[PDB]
């Protein structure tokens, strides 16, 4: 299932100038989907044109005050679907799929039950069906990690496309008064914007990324349009020390964890094959620490040019030379690296 970059619109705790002017600035890093939201006709109309020359998926949160299944007002606009923040019983949301304006019907992925179950029990067209997360504007009241999963698990089962929110940090309009940052999961409120969108990516359960507050910085954009979407990629910083050869084993691979782990580090070693031939001289060997990057050297025999990752504390092993570390934000990322898992290593 393809991944997409989206971004988040308030038009009216803003202008149709700047909000046209975003949207412009987004497409530029490969972002193709918009959320947008109607708290309180012609300049949404304009807005949701300018999105779709610019190739960008519209879906409408409108709040249900504001106005019953003639959703042909959502169609005049140009929206491309529409979100239910709230369900209903089941049947209701089964019979919006089967809508003759082509609309999509989002579904918030944040209620843990069997939601869908009840929807496709009657006679629904589930390809009309996607998915998305809540976001929270309260400090402490986002998703628990385990929750989240359950969740996007369920969609993720139905073969049902989700998305959820993470937070910018220049980013200041919201939908309402309070905003602590608009993301989904409560541990991405203070992660840094690439990070967030790399640890939704990496559960292998989250396929559309969308900034939830706006706007965020044009630096923020490219950060996010550079990734890829994928794999994995691990910030690296290097030892003063590390060697060229050193840097083009970390850098130039693409690395597997070999599928027999151990919980101690992930051994990268396919890449010794390429490296064996090359000199490692010993070097000050130090503790090793989890998010090291490490490299068996000369001394090390058979398990010379052997690249690894220390996910555990062991002792000093003169055995390896230190070549750099994951970047400290990024070290819960190591998790993802499962059993016959590629991922890079990036500065």
């Known amino acids: 299932m393809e991944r ?16 046209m002017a975003y949207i412009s600035a987004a497409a530029r890093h490969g972002f ?14 304009e807005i949701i044109n300018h999105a779709k020359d610019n ?16 959703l042909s007002f959502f169609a005049e606009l140009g929206a491309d679907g529409i979100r239910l923040d709230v369900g209903f019983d089941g049947l209701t949301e089964a ?29 629904a067209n589930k390809s009309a069906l996607i998915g998305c997360h809540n976001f929270y504007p309260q400090k402490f009241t986002g998703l628990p990690y385990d929750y989240f999963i359950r969740c996007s698990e369920r969609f993720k089962k139905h073969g049902i496309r989700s998305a959820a929110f993470i937070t910018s940090h220049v980013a200041n309009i919201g939908p309402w008064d309070i905003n602590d940052g608009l993301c989904t999961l409560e541990e991405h409120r203070n992660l840094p914007i690439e990070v967030q969108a790399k640890h939704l990516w990496a559960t292998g359960l989250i396929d559309d990324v969308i900034i939830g507050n706006a706007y965020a910085s044009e630096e923020e954009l490219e950060k996010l349009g550079n990734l890829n979407r994928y794999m994995l990629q691990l910030k690296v910083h290097f030892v003063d020390e590390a060697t060229e050869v050193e840097k083009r084993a970390t850098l130039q691979e693409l690395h597997v964890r070999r599928g027999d782990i151990t919980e101690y580090m992930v051994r990268s070693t396919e890449v010794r094959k390429k490296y064996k031939d090359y000199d490692f001289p010993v070097r000050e060997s130090v503790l090793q620490e989890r998010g090291q990057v490490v490299i068996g050297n000369n001394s090390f025999g058979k398990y010379k040019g052997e690249l690894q990752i220390i996910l555990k504390e062991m002792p000093i092993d003169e055995r390896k030379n230190i070549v750099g570390t994951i970047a400290e934000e990024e070290l819960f990322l190591l998790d993802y690296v499962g059993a016959w898992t590629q991922f890079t290593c990036v500065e």
């Open 32 to 45: 193709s989907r918009i959320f947008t939201c109607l708290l309180s006709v012609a300049e949404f109309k």
């Open 95 to 123: 019979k919006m799929t089967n809508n003759p304006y082509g609309l999509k019907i989002e579904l918030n992925v944040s209620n843990d039950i069997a939601y869908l179950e009840n929807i496709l029990s009657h006679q």
């Open 55 to 70: 190739n960008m998926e519209v879906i409408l949160d409108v709040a249900p005050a504001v106005f019953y299944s003639d």
């Open 4 to 19: 997409k970059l989206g971004i988040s619109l308030y038009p009216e705790h803003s202008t149709k100038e700047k909000d």
